[PDB]
Scaffold this motif. Sequence first.
Motif, short mmCIF file in Angstrom:
data_model
loop_
_atom_site.label_atom_id
_atom_site.label_comp_id
_atom_site.label_asym_id
_atom_site.label_seq_id
_atom_site.Cartn_x
_atom_site.Cartn_y
_atom_site.Cartn_z
N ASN A 1 5.90 4.09 -2.17
CA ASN A 1 5.03 3.22 -2.94
C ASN A 1 5.54 1.79 -2.89
O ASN A 1 6.74 1.55 -2.74
CB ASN A 1 4.93 3.66 -4.40
CG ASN A 1 3.74 4.54 -4.65
OD1 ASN A 1 2.99 4.86 -3.74
ND2 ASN A 1 3.56 4.93 -5.91
N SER A 2 4.61 0.84 -3.02
CA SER A 2 4.93 -0.59 -3.08
C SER A 2 5.82 -1.00 -1.91
O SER A 2 6.96 -1.44 -2.08
CB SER A 2 5.58 -0.94 -4.41
OG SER A 2 4.76 -0.54 -5.50
N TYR B 1 16.99 7.93 -4.49
CA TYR B 1 16.66 6.54 -4.79
C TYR B 1 17.91 5.67 -4.66
O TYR B 1 18.47 5.19 -5.64
CB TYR B 1 15.99 6.43 -6.16
CG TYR B 1 15.05 7.56 -6.42
CD1 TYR B 1 14.10 7.93 -5.48
CD2 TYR B 1 15.11 8.28 -7.60
CE1 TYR B 1 13.24 8.97 -5.72
CE2 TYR B 1 14.26 9.32 -7.84
CZ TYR B 1 13.32 9.66 -6.90
OH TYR B 1 12.48 10.71 -7.16
N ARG C 1 2.57 8.56 2.10
CA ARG C 1 3.24 9.80 1.74
C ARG C 1 3.70 10.52 2.99
O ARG C 1 2.89 10.83 3.87
CB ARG C 1 2.31 10.69 0.92
CG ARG C 1 3.02 11.68 0.03
CD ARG C 1 2.20 12.94 -0.13
NE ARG C 1 2.73 13.80 -1.17
CZ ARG C 1 2.68 13.53 -2.47
NH1 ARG C 1 2.11 12.42 -2.90
NH2 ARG C 1 3.19 14.38 -3.35
N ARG D 1 0.84 -1.19 0.00
CA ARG D 1 0.00 0.00 0.00
C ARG D 1 0.88 1.25 0.00
O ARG D 1 2.03 1.23 0.44
CB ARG D 1 -0.94 -0.02 1.21
CG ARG D 1 -1.94 1.12 1.28
CD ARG D 1 -2.71 1.26 -0.02
NE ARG D 1 -3.30 0.01 -0.50
CZ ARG D 1 -4.20 -0.72 0.17
NH1 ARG D 1 -4.66 -0.32 1.34
NH2 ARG D 1 -4.65 -1.84 -0.36
N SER D 2 0.32 2.34 -0.51
CA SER D 2 1.05 3.60 -0.65
C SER D 2 1.03 4.38 0.66
O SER D 2 0.24 4.11 1.56
CB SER D 2 0.44 4.44 -1.77
OG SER D 2 -0.97 4.41 -1.72
N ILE E 1 9.45 8.11 -4.36
CA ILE E 1 9.52 9.31 -5.20
C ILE E 1 9.57 10.50 -4.26
O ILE E 1 8.55 10.87 -3.68
CB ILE E 1 8.31 9.43 -6.14
CG1 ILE E 1 8.31 8.31 -7.16
CG2 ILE E 1 8.33 10.76 -6.85
CD1 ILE E 1 6.93 7.83 -7.51
N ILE E 2 10.74 11.10 -4.10
CA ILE E 2 10.84 12.30 -3.30
C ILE E 2 10.33 13.48 -4.11
O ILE E 2 10.53 13.54 -5.33
CB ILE E 2 12.28 12.54 -2.81
CG1 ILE E 2 12.29 13.65 -1.78
CG2 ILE E 2 13.15 12.95 -3.94
CD1 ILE E 2 13.57 13.75 -1.02
N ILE E 3 9.64 14.40 -3.45
CA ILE E 3 9.10 15.58 -4.09
C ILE E 3 9.40 16.77 -3.20
O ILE E 3 9.05 16.77 -2.01
CB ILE E 3 7.58 15.46 -4.31
CG1 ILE E 3 7.29 14.27 -5.22
CG2 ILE E 3 7.06 16.73 -4.92
CD1 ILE E 3 5.86 13.83 -5.21
N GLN F 1 6.74 10.17 -1.43
CA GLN F 1 5.54 9.38 -1.71
C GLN F 1 5.97 7.93 -1.82
O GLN F 1 6.25 7.42 -2.90
CB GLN F 1 4.85 9.88 -2.97
CG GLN F 1 3.46 9.32 -3.18
CD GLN F 1 3.43 8.00 -3.88
OE1 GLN F 1 4.30 7.69 -4.69
NE2 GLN F 1 2.42 7.19 -3.57
#
Lengths: 165, 183, 73, 118, 116, 100
Positions: free
Chosen positions: D83-84, D59, D18, D15-16, D68-70, D81
């Motif tokens: 993920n997986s 990464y 953030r 599950r995701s 995914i860094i934002i 964020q």
Amino acid sequence: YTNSFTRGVYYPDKVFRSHSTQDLFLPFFSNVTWFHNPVLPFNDGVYFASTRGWIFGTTLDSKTQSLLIVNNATNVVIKVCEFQYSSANNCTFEYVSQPFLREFVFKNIDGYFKIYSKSALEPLVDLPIGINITRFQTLYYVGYLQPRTFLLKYNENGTITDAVD
Amino acid sequence: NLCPFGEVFNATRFASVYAWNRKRISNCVADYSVLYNSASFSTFKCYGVSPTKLNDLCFTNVYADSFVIRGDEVRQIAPGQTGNIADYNYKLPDDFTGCVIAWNSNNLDSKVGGNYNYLYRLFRKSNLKPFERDISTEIYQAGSTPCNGVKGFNCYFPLQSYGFQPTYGVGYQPYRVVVLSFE
Amino acid sequence: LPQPPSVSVAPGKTARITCGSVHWYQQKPRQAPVVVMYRFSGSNATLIISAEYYCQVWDRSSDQPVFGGGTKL
Amino acid sequence: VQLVESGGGLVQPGRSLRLSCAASGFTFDDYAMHWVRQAPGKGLEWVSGASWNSGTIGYADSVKGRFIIIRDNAKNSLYLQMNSLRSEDTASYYCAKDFSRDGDAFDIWGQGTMVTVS
Amino acid sequence: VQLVESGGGLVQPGGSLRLSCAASEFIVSANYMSWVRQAPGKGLEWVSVIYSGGSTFYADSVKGRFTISRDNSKNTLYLQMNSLRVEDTAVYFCARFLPTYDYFDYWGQGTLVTVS
Amino acid sequence: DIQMTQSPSSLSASVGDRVTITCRTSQSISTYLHWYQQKPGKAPKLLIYAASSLHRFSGSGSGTHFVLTINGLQPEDFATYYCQHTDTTPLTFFGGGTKV
């Protein structure tokens, strides 16, 4: 409290050497408010005097930008962020230079914020702040500027010596 | 002083297009002459402000929107254009004043085995408002059936990796882009 | 990256740690690891001393920090 | 200066999730930011990390194509964020900040959440 | 998923004819959709595509004549074929273009739009 | 404008044989050539995407030469096979098509 004076003359927003000027000035024997830190209005300009900073703005919240001046023992910092200060974001101007009877005149015209300090208040610095300013607080004597005609006697080396309402 | 164009254009890494960076530049004299006089910039075109008269007009503020797109995708960085980038990643308004450069960046960006640092938005239910970025990253439900944030068939992750390789052609090679704007 | 498993020291002595610039870090039992160098000193290296200690040599060949779990003093 | 994290909480595998990192004590768009995670019983590990007004030098080794860094300089914030997710991702995720504008040693650390996948 | 397109017929040259793809499980307001026409005896030819945001594109031979559009209320996709010519006689498939590796995942069935 | 080329066309009906289809493209498309299997009277079927990943067929190739291989040919695959690629300027180009 209340008081009266004879002062408040600065160089008429123009840096010529040399006269009659129709500018924003402080009436000679006017009502000035002796204080012993409320949020006073700005009107069109203020005369400040005391024997270590200022916060200017419209709402003094994060909704609008606000001017902030602080004097260190070595340095003066001028910033205009959306101050809450518990928060400070979205700001576009920061000024850093040497720190500023000590009397000041502040006017905010045409997006410029002009400062005069020390009669004959020499121009300290003007800043391209570009925000609206309506109310203010001191971080003293407080007067308000009036648009009246003046006569200024320059004294062969500039140095406005005498003035006439 | 001088505006920090050296920090922007000569930076080491650029943001991916979907989360493009935005730098506010103000209170400085900007020397566009060095930008205009460069042999590296394989793209320099702009609108309502002639490149010669750049050093003649003073604006209240200047932006520097930087990102990295595929080489063949640069033509969509233009006012009124449409495509993946214009519709979903970086949309320019029709009255755009300010302008765009792009220079090939293959050596800096593309490394063997895929450079997964660069992403672009792939699906979106509505085109972007101009100069507006979105970071929403919910699994895009492209079908009627729900899937509850679990990636699978009919629910696709809205971000896709460019996957730059040094062996690609100039069409697929990375082009760093900077989109200056004015007041 | 390596570093000795774990060390110990009697108070007021000299404590020597080898990180097999190195920007050593220090984390107290359950806290946010804090920096010590970029009594403590770094001859290149060692954080000479007169909690959990880690290094951060930023490999420029891979371009990413490689903290080698250091040691517990 | 301070950094505050959020988003951490029990997450089912696959599950995701953030994360967040808000900064207020400095010019956000001058120093790089990072995401440094420490698995319980283990030392420090590097997850990702942005740059000053720039993009993802990140990464690290096992989070390629998953995290995914934002970085959003507008809101003085940093997002990861995730993920997986897997079993090894169960760790505290300290935010961080380095001296340099692009990448160098970290100086100021957030307290970090306690993201748990079980 | 049973994309079904319908509306084929015989229209004199220069007329105007409407094609309608009726998606079963997809929602056309979200997916990319496209029309791919196969002239009798030839291979597939692309016609139009509509992005998720509504942006549309057309092939060179059909720009200015066809207009692709969709209606979200009844989950249908439309191709306003106008100014038909002799060489538009073909079979029109409504595909489901996927922005990824860019391929046509699922296809319609075929409506023989003929001109005579 | 991309220009594709499928060679050869209308192959030999040899059951249980390794069947090979190539797709020479005029320009370097990296991995953006997809293989469709259009049976007669039906709509294409998307055997492959990215030129490598299925959707017994085994495709390979990058840049200019892409191959579609049917290692075991079945009497049920005597169909017509097309390439594809979409330009960044949105434009899909289908190949000529090869029978079997």
